[PDB]
């Protein structure tokens, strides 16, 4: 009935309620304090975010290509439940649904007219734009996801422990994680994953309303935005309470199939030789200047460009890493550490770059051809970039409708996917909690997205993400260091006949 | 009296004769058809050529630095027939002997006034020219050659099958390679190797007639070029009347000694500190932006520069790869996979880069010091680049004469060497075919070179090379993926006490 | 009484006396002979210096990451006398630290108004300056130091041989090192380390006099410079004779603490976010263009910039490497080769780069913010760069006095430290020589510094350093190739059940 963890459940509820009250009955105060706080945090700790993501990626590479990579998740006498192709498909399904569909065109074009670093020619501007979107989506995001998923899988399969952030700090804290010391980590993890899920929720909402406005000229107001959010979460709780089926795996497969069909349609109807040439060239350039852009901090110029694009992306990945890592760990049992890390790092990191090329590089090809019309639309609003990019394609209305449907299905999938992660983190156990708690948490994330959207749109999701992702960046660093020790202890124990 | 393979010998004769007949009865038709076909193929599949060469090089590096590198060629109970120094010395002479002399000077200067990418200063133009020259000749070519030689040696020594391209696909096709399925593989390999050897023959004859015209002011019609071709082939077939007495290894050592003496003379008489400094700096820059230039596809500019220089070079290295790999594998028995790959990748690549520095960087030093006279000559024709370069050196006539003699001897060695590869591929066995078959194949190679020369000069060799190297690029990728399987099988079978 | 090595003692003393004579009774001739000779050697062998340092660094990396890295120094039955932190702390204290205080500010600003390569924007100039000072101080210096220290430790602990340069060539010279073939090696090593210590002493005294002149407006004639030199050396020999005996380690710890406090104070009072951002970004850029700047030889421009900055630094590191490597080996017993190399290459290099950032990047931040006043001072003279840098900080006089005291104590430590190495190399044994010989060698290095100062200032230390570092570059290459054989011998001997 009420199987909960009080010090985590009540603390998260109280903190979320306090934030909602602050943002709903101090309008001007919250609207003035949030962007100043976000700017201060990002300006002061962009170096720390960059160092954290680089260290996590280097640690993932090291774990993949060391003696620790021979350890098989779930024990030596375990076998994978899925083939490599299915595992890779599910890994790409875990990332990314809404962020990809929202930024794949807005970001490469926003790095064209607003370059991260000064360039002279438009060719170099396009190359730099593709390089920076590859940096944001290519390997560091999947590095963080792979590290969190590896930690969760190792400490929930090889250690017979709940796959929350409590058990990830066992090796160096012993039994102290059970009382008031792992409670803080669980609270921070729940808050960070809730805010990351709510950011994805909000991104989907803004893009779906922009698409409806562009297609039909409808005059939307935040009232029907809230109505859309409530209706979608109602569909989710209907699918949860009166379960038609396991509407996650089948919906994940449908989403992957529809996204692949969309990518193939854009690849064929748009440029085809240009897309392949640009994919090869841009991946090579991204891997050639990897250390130059990964560690770049904009220290000498001081343009402040990283405060909205790069540091925000690192904070987002770090903050909502628990949600992605949970489902990365669910589907990876019986696969060794090296194979797991390489599979999470490379294949989804390559498919994401392929999608980035297929969409953003095609947009940049249109722009470089003199057809500057996405630049003006994105300068007006970045939520219509996809629906302006589909204007110069055959079946513009059908492609726009399919993109809206894909966004809405990713919306349901994320809402029904992160709800169970938050429920498990909040109430412990492994899913014995009743469905009403899951529905309540879905409602909470929906209203959090609603309040954040009404408090600035795409200027309050980033603020909360960065604010709650900085301490979670610290937690990620400590968690990587503790996972090293736990893996070393397990390897030493196994190598004893 | 002809030990032959009917479906390979007859098919190769038929397609070669059909191409010759088409080129001789339809001058204008073939002269319009061939450049268009080559341009279409290169424009559509430059990305594929780049991916193929990069993947082959990465596969070679992986095979050198993994557990697969401990496998000893010819079995554990085998010892090298040559010392490491002599093996390294004769490795460089194995392939690209005539192309080195043709493009040692014409290519770095052609990348100066016709830059691959836009540059402002002449210094950057020279650096880029040397970088792209090193890319074309440094490591990818020797990566392809090392992979092909490793596959040939593994499947002709460790597994005892005949050393043709039929046996390289045994692991994943079973016994199907013996009939009408590996026949196509052998036909394509023979065509690619004959069209890659005819390209070198054409380069040699073009440069030798250009040198004769430059030195003596003679007017040589295509009839005298055909006479030169026939005279050289007659000398080659006289040398293989019955023996006599197998003047190939001695000629190979003489060619290596003469080329080394020529390089030392150019190094001493020309700049000596500049060449050494530029060698170090250019090798460092080549290894610094290796991924930047290897994966570069010229996609945002579309200048078409890669259609003649880079894609043609990849198709050339792939096309005549059987010929180079055969004699790379002949002289490598008893050497482990790691040592073999590192000795075919590094040492001959380093010596090639040293030669190309000694010649092209010296030419660029002459150009950068206000003496722009190789640019004007190369813009007119590229076959007189070396003979114009030797103009500003002491003993210009003697150096030109020894260069012509070295080109003629490389011509003889290549004609006598590739006939063996074509004859072995066409007739199977391991050298049981009669001498008249070798004579006929040398004649066919010579007339193919003559016909390609009369059909456009240095515009039909590239066309044929690219056309027959694209499907051979596919075959190279498949063979690279099958070699790891067929060699992991041997590694597993050997690691069984 | 007179326990010496007469072939080494007599030859080194006679050569030093001859140089002092030709510098003190041939002013006009030597003042033209020395800079011309230095320019000749650096121009002719900059490529050799670059190749030598790159090969040494690559060899150190390879030895750290191969089967040889498992070899435990001092034998398997040995343990580290110090913990990891206490060893990392004193690794950086072994040197540099006198040139650190001299070129922390003068070098990154001298690379600003006098760029190694042409740049347009001031931001690019600052990035290039930071990159090149990182190259000079980051990894190649510590690579040379790690190689020399590893050779010395391996041949003085695992082989029970004297820790001089005699024993480093045992593997392929056998007992021939004991007479007239290893005597030359010891003589060259003693001369190189004496001249390196003299260059450090000259830098220290130059900066001390410059700081005194800047703070107090004093006029210091070279007579007072000689008086200061003699006073400091007299303090050192008084400590050696009467004071004694372990205070060198106490003074080393005091120097490390004072330098860390000075660096922290500059980090806090000056920019704090800028320094961290620039540290991360500049380390990333240094590791991104590593092969581009390490192998750069300035061959296409011929500006001559490398003759005073990069080649001089390589020659300096190579020349005084025996002194640094001796104390790197003393404080490293019972540590495996991999751990030793990774702890000498990385951590001291990282701390040196952090010091360069904290000081030079702060200076570049001041310069880039319109405050161009260090540029004029450094153009006038580079010795007062640090004292002009502290002008725009709180507690300018206190920080200047602390820097002067730190330089003076580094002077004392370096003299008392290099006297041990010179005495041990010249008289053999392991510290049985009388104290009078030690103080005599300290006096000799002091008068060498005085004579070199009176012969051109900072134009004769570099000359002698380069002249005696080129043959020592050859010797370092030979010993680096000898260590592999002599330590593979030990690895094979140990791996025999």
Numbering used by the authors:
A (entry chain A), B (entry chain C), C (entry chain B): 10 to 506
From the article:
Thus, in the deep-sea bacterium Myroides profundi D25, TMA is taken into the cells through a TMA transporter TmaT and then oxidized to TMAO, resulting in the accumulation of intracellular TMAO to millimolar levels to function as a piezolyte. TmaT is a member of the betaine-choline-carnitine transporter family, and we show that TmaT is an Na+/TMA symporter, which possessed high specificity and binding affinity toward TMA. TmaT forms a homotrimer structure in solution. Each TmaT monomer has 12 transmembrane helices, and the TMA transport channel is formed by a four-helix bundle.
To elucidate the mechanism of TmaT importing TMA, we employed the cryo-EM single-particle technique to determine the TmaT structure. TmaT assembles a homotrimer in solution, similar to other reported structures of BCCT carriers. The overall structure of TmaT consists of three regions: the extracellular, intracellular, and transmembrane regions, with the overall transmembrane width of approximately 33 Å. The structures of the three TmaT monomers are nearly identical (with the root mean square deviation [RMSD] of 0.2–0.4 Å), with each monomer forms a cylindrical structure consisting of 12 transmembrane helices (TM1–TM12). Most of the transmembrane helices are connected by short loops, with the exception for TM7 and TM8, which are linked by a long helix (H7). TM3 and TM8 consist of both inner membrane portions (TM3i and TM8i) and outer membrane portions (TM3e and TM8e), making them discontinuous transmembrane helices. In the TmaT trimer structure, the loop Thr304-Gly313 from one monomer inserts into an adjacent monomer and resembles a gate latch and bolt pattern. In addition, hydrogen bond interactions are formed with the residues Glu290, Asn291, Thr308, and Tyr309 in the interface between two adjacent monomers, suggesting a relatively stable trimer composition. Comparison of the TmaT and TmaT-TMA LCI structures revealed that the side chain of Met105 occupies the TMA-binding site when TMA is not bounded, suggesting an important role of Met105 in TMA recognition. However, they diverge in substrate recognition, as the side chain of Met105 in TmaT occupies the substrate-binding pockets during substrate binding, a characteristic not observed in the structures of BetP and CaiT.
